[PDB]
């Protein structure tokens, strides 16, 4: 098309194992996890550009009377973003 | 730490119409539509711009005849900020 991305990834629907419509969760997975990103050769091999998979997690938070923030997170990670990572600073 | 071509902010948000409320993890572009870092390392015919991506509540129903009925009437959730190489005209 008219838009190219450095990292090939796949977006799809996943259905929650614990539960007139069904609610599917959208996810994005890196097709080639950690393999160099397109046009890597245009970057110094110093920072080897590779495709990194990112996740989001169901998050429950509670703020106590003393302001303490208590967070609870689902053990199940949800693939959410496949972007190019550079070894820079 | 590993750098990315587009600066973004990962943050916790609350949807607003035991005592734990649902907080939604989001990723906003720090400068969407602005050029990606190291744009000069890409062929000059391309226009590398930071693009904001979203995910959204997706309700699906399959009829008895196989027809799929989709409902996506919720709000969009900033989910990923990544570099998009806009192809030159030709």
Swiss-Prot record, chain A:
Residues 5-85 form the Spaetzle domain. Changing residue 81 to S/T: Reduced phenotypic rescue of a mutant. Disulfide bonds join 7-51, 30-82, 37-84. Transmembrane segments: none annotated. It comes from the Eukaryota. Changing residue 38 to R: Strongly reduced signaling. This is Protein spaetzle C-106. The lineage of its organism: Eukaryota, Metazoa, Ecdysozoa, Arthropoda, Hexapoda. The gene is spz.
